[PDB]
């Protein structure tokens, strides 16, 4: 079953104290009114970022796992809470498919929902909302820690009564900075035409009228390459496939130019015992140019 | 390459660049002469030893086999790159081969990425699938370090101080000492390395625990929380006005 994310996907993009200004920010964000998986444990993809929302009063879920292979002996970020302190580690502790060495990093330090934003060095944001489960009101997240790892991540997992996960998207967002300096309202710049107008006019009030806002630039469906027929091929066969050839002293030099250099037979074919060249790629020869070439044949 | 965090301290880069031991010392986006008086949020030191001929490629924007598949800097990097001859302490007679480097990979390395995975490189048409052989080269290739070779093949020790100059509470602040807090008068203030002129006055602002300084619509600093005391300040510019003769 799935649930909507009414207005979640905005954190504080910067550390400055902004006040009384409609400020524009662009970053990876989760679009407002987007779908999340209403999970009641499994493995999920990771594209650019992740959002998280946990429904629990007893701290059931305390950590996460990350990485590409997500298997033992593979570098993974491990955040864990031991009920006495919270630990952040990069130790790939042995984990099977459903978990309930070479340690490199270490760090030890119903009523509410925790919202987490991840992106890639690593970033973390969160904030808490003491509620008497998801109100549709404004949501902004405060950065927590940005601990670097310098490693590729394309997937992740969870540690272990429900939670919500949603994927952030590249977008443009605008913030109503008040006198108080916090965030009280933000409007998407790609949800609905009124919102796009609010952003382009850069205000929360639009007086009646036509307003040109942006463009409709269609994207291409595919990329086409067209050229003349492959004719004509150089006679490399004559030099290579010659039954009779001239001896090492009497070698035949064949000048070659104005030819389609089909290097495929030379290197795609594995029959030839030695294919040696220095300063030029044996596999990329089709991608290089030579004005004039000569060929010598002997035994 | 190992990454050692440098933070929660005070630094002195003047001795580091002045010393004659550093035959190579190149700074990008900052000039060393004024490193002493500007503070930084975090400094990263990455240590790795490269062959001599490939020092000049490791710079933002440049490529090369190690520059591409082994270590690469952002094209917009800020900081300094440091290198020097290391035959004396590292290279041993008879050949030093305890060092390796990755040469062939399917994809290039994006900024600050480290790869130590150990699978063969598939270069041929047919997948190797764990077979070593023709067109199946393991990516790691060792350095052949003989203490007598030419400097072009000699080992240079390298550390990259990537100065991450960020707007955040800074940690490594440089040697320059403080001066007593001044208020309600025109002064050339300098907090955490931001050079400014204006009158300090306490503000009504309340910062979020990670918040450091505010801003104005014209991208001019308008408030700062004092570094050694949580003093919210208002950087009002000193009075000025046009004068016209009659």
């Amino acid at each position, epitope marked *: 079953a799935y649930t909507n994310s009414f207005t979640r996907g905005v954190y504080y993009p910067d550390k400055v104290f902004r006040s009384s200004v409609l400020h524009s920010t662009q970053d990876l964000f989760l679009p407002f009114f987007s779908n999340v998986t209403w999970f009641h444990n499994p493995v999920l993809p990771f594209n650019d970022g992740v959002y998280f929302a946990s429904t629990e009063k007893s701290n059931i879920i305390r950590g996460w796992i990350f990485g590409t292979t997500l298997d033992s002996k593979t570098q993974s970020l491990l955040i864990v809470n031991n009920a006495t302190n919270v630990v952040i580690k990069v130790c790939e502790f042995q984990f099977c498919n459903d978990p309930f060495n070479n340690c490199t990093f270490e760090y030890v330090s119903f009523k509410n929902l925790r919202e987490f934003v991840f992106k890639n060095y690593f970033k973390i944001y969160s904030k808490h909302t003491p509620i008497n489960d998801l109100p549709q009101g404004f949501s902004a997240l405060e950065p927590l820690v940005d601990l670097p790892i310098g490693i590729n991540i394309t997937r992740f997992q969870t540690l272990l009564a429900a939670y919500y996960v949603g994927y952030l998207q590249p977008r443009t967002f605008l913030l109503k900075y008040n006198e108080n300096g916090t965030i009280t309202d933000a409007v998407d710049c790609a949800l609905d035409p009124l919102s796009e107008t609010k952003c382009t006019l850069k205000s929360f009030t639009v007086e009646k009228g036509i307003y040109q806002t942006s463009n409709f630039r269609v994207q291409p469906t595919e990329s086409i390459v067209r050229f003349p027929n492959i004719t004509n091929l150089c006679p490399f066969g004559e030099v290579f496939n010659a039954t009779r050839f001239a001896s090492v002293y009497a070698w035949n030099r064949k000048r070659i130019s104005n030819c389609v250099a089909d290097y495929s037979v030379l290197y795609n074919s594995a029959s030839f015992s*030695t*294919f*040696k*060249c*220095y300063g030029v790629s*044996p596999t990329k020869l089709n991608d290089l140019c030579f004005t004039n070439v000569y060929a010598d044949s002997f035994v | 390459w190992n990454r050692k965090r440098i933070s929660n301290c005070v630094a002195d880069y003047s001795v580091l660049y002045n010393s004659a031991s550093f035959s190579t010392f190149k700074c990008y986006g900052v000039s060393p002469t004024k490193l002493n008086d500007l503070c930084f949020t975090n400094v990263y030191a990455d240590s790795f030893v490269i062959r001599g001929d490939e020092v000049r490629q490791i710079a933002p924007g440049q490529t090369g086999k190690i520059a591409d598949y082994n270590y690469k800097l952002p094209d917009d990097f800020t900081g300094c790159v440091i290198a020097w001859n290391s035959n004396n302490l590292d290279s041993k007679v*008879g*050949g*030093n*081969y*305890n060092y*390796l480097y990755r040469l062939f990979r399917k994809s290039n390395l994006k900024p600050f990425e480290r790869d130590i995975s*150990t699978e*063969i490189y598939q270069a041929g048409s047919t997948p190797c699938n*764990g*077979v*070593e*052989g*023709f*067109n*199946c*080269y*393991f990516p*790691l*290739q*060792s350095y*052949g370090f003989q203490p007598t070779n030419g400097v072009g093949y000699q080992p240079y020790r390298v550390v990259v101080l990537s100065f991450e100059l960020l707007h955040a509470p800074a940690t490594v602040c440089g040697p320059k000492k403080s001066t007593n807090l001044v208020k309600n008068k025109c002064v050339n203030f300098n907090f955490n390395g931001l050079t400014g002129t204006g009158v300090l006055t306490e503000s009504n602002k309340k910062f979020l625990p990670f918040q450091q300084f505010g801003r104005d619509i014209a991208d001019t600093t308008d408030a700062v929380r004092d570094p050694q005391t949580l003093e919210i300040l208002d950087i009002t510019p000193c009075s000025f006005g046009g004068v016209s003769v009659i």
Partner: nanobody
Amino acid sequence: QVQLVESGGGLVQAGGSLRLSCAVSGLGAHRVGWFRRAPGKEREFVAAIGANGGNTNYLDSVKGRFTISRDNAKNTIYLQMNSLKPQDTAVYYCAARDIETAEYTYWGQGTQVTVSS
């Protein structure tokens, strides 16, 4: 250049541990490897180690039961045959790489290893 010569190949009983040791000329900067020609099959990988290296890979057939060693002192290499089951008989060879476009640039003429059940 670098030249390879092999020693220590012969007939041994099933389960026997033999010593194959191949000598090289001017080695030190090349990832040495051991290879075998099966009577009915072409050459296949056995073991490979870099200079002063721990980079070890073995085929599943040789997994857990053959290890190679590098002296770095006597200019020769050692491969550990343990309980060699009979169907692993072949002619063994050494090979190494400096800069290659084929499997490996320099090879060893090798020798014969035979096992009787």
